[PDB]
Design a protein. Structure first.
Length: 604
């Protein structure tokens, strides 16, 4: 005999499906006299499970079921706990018909019951979380007058955040750009400026709020360009933890940071801006992309964004899944796990795979070994996706944490793409000529010549260019000092090998472009024909350019004219251009550059 005549209390957690909790109260007022089970609920309220309730004494100190204090306090204003939830605390999660506490051993007194957002599992429709609350904490003095089995009705609203990522200026969470997947033409060295705009509801109660971005290889994330504002106002050094990696970043609100978006009177607007440079690994007509995820919850969250990866040499790529609980400790497979294999350059779905509870891995074959892909986990209720950092080609690992948080926000991303042109050097009988050197101009007659910016190329890159150039010079000279019959496949390979090395060196040196006056300058992009007469230019914006030959094939004359050419969205790959880049390939994807040769005749 220590407790009271009120031997049980049941907490029913009510959700205001509209925004009106006051209206819920203004039906429970007029309905009751004392605290018995309400037979029927307002049309405006709904009872939800998965909300955690814990008992306190009148001073906000957590108690066990005999009313003993447990030396952890809860702040009456923020609801924040001063320690870890004590193991023997009188706490329980609501089930469909509420949380029924046994109150039989509690001494006569005043008590509080709090909602602990941070320890609940509830998740609304379309990933909404509980925001505002009315009549929390519950103040109940025991015994409840006349009642032995009491029932109480704490109230809540729920809300959802919104997001979109797009180029600087274009980001709109309410109506994302519909033609986003359409790549925008850019040249190498361009700085791409991105914008992330997140709307966070009023009275948010986030424990986590992390943004994570990962980029395909052809985009270099520009470190130190990240800026974050909340309603236009810059966050402070201590409001977030920013970690920067070669392929992008993770941005996490701290407690001071969350303070600024949580428990606020109006929808709040978070903006994160930053840039990336399209670099020398961009493959022509192959989009590059960023990819952001927003991982949030009333409970802490461990999910993040996928990491693109390439298949191994065999065109094989393997996903491997592991599972853990909110503390990081191993647990058995939570459920079926479905993933979409997305081509990471384009943003399009390659195929779908499912992992049954018993088989934690899957391998997909027949993939392009030059193409980056990602397995995007389809939302598993209760579970957040942690994509592990990439250590090797052909392997992607995913860890499933049982946070019990809403599905993450995953905006679509824009794309960017460079264009290019291919050529073959021939005589008038289509014989492929080696060693013809070319530069690119911006007019048929005067104008400037294409170069890489001096300030955007190091000395190592520069000398590799001249070293391979010199090397090529020698191979061409040797091949030219042979005769028609002696210039067989094996000898042409020699020239092809050297020209390939040169060509890669230029592509690597071409980190940026500028137009200049002098064709003699060292930075001028020079193109050279291989023994199959081939040369290409990659990394360009669309437009009209003009080849100028600077040194003709041995035995031939110098062209006294520039050759006009068009760079387009398909000029690098389109068939029907007049000649095979590589003989016998079946695709005439190049333009012929026809050299002339003066001959001295005879008579009689
Ligand atoms: Ni690539
Ligand atoms: Ni995304
Ligand atoms: Ni480079």
């Amino acid at each position: 005999g220590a407790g009271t005549t009120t031997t049980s209390v049941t907490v029913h957690k009510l959700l205001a499906t509209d925004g009106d909790m006051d209206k819920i109260a203004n039906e429970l007022e007029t309905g009751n006299y004392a605290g018995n089970k309400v037979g029927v609920l307002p049309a405006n309220a709904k009872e939800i499970a998965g909300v955690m309730f814990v008992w306190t004494n009148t001073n906000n100190e957590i108690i066990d079921e005999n009313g003993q204090t447990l030396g952890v306090n809860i702040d009456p204003q923020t609801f924040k706990l001063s320690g870890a939830m004590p193991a023997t605390a009188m706490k329980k999660l609501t089930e469909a018909e509420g949380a029924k506490f046994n109150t039989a051993n509690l001494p006569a007194a005043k008590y509080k019951i709090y909602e602990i957002h941070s320890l609940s599992t509830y998740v609304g429709e379309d990933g909404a979380t509980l925001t505002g609350s009315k009549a929390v904490p519950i103040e109940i003095e025991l015994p409840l007058n006349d009642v032995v089995d009491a029932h109480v009705y704490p109230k809540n609203t729920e809300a959802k955040p919104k997001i979109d990522k797009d180029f600087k200026g274009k980001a709109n969470p309410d109506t994302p750009r519909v033609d986003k997947d359409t790549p925008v033409n850019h040249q190498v060295g361009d700085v791409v400026e991105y914008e992330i705009v997140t709307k966070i509801p009023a009275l948010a109660n986030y424990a986590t709020a992390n943004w994570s971005d990962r980029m395909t290889e052809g985009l270099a994330f520009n470190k130190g360009t990240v800026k974050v504002t909340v309603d236009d106002v810059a966050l402070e050094a201590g409001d977030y933890a920013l970690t920067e990696v070669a392929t992008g970043f993770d941005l996490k609100l701290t407690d001071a940071g969350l303070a600024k978006v949580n428990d606020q009177n109006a929808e709040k607007t978070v903006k994160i801006t930053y840039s990336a440079t399209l670099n020398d690994k961009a493959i022509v007509e192959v989009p590059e992309s960023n990819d952001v995820t927003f991982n949030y919850g009333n409970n802490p969250d461990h999910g993040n964004t996928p990491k693109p990866n390439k298949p191994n040499e065999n065109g094989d790529l393997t996903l491997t899944k592991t599972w853990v609980d909110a503390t990081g400790a191993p647990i058995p497979a939570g459920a079926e796990a479905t993933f979409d294999l997305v081509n990471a350059q384009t943003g399009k779905v390659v195929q779908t795979v499912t992992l049954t509870t018993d088989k934690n891995t899957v391998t997909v074959n027949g993939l392009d070994k030059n193409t980056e892909y990602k397995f995007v986990e389809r939302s598993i209720k209760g579970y957040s996706a942690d994509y592990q950092e990439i250590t090797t080609a052909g392997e992607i690992a995913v860890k499933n944490w049982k946070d019990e948080n809403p599905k993450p926000l995953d905006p679509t991303e824009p794309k960017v793409v460079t264009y290019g042109k291919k050529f073959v050097k021939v005589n008038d009988k289509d014989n492929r000529l080696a060693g013809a050197e070319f530069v690119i101009a911006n007019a048929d007659n005067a104008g400037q010549y294409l170069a890489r910016k001096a300030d955007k190329v190091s000395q190592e890159e520069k000398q590799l260019v001249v070293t391979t150039k010199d090397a090529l010079d020698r191979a061409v000279a040797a091949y030219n000092a042979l005769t028609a019959q002696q210039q067989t496949q094996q000898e042409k390979e020699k020239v092809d090998k050297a020209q390939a090395a040169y060509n890669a060196a230029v592509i690597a040196a071409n980190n940026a472009f500028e137009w200049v006056a002098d064709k003699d300058n060292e930075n001028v992009v020079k193109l050279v024909s291989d023994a199959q007469g081939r040369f290409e230019i990659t990394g360009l914006l669309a437009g009209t350019y003009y080849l100028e030959e600077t040194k003709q094939p041995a035995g031939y004359a110098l062209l006294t004219s520039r050759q006009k050419f068009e760079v387009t969205a398909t000029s690098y790959s389109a068939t029907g251009q007049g000649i095979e880049y590589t003989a016998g390939s079946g695709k005439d994807d190049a333009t012929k550059v026809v050299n002339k040769k003066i001959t001295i005749p005879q008579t009689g």
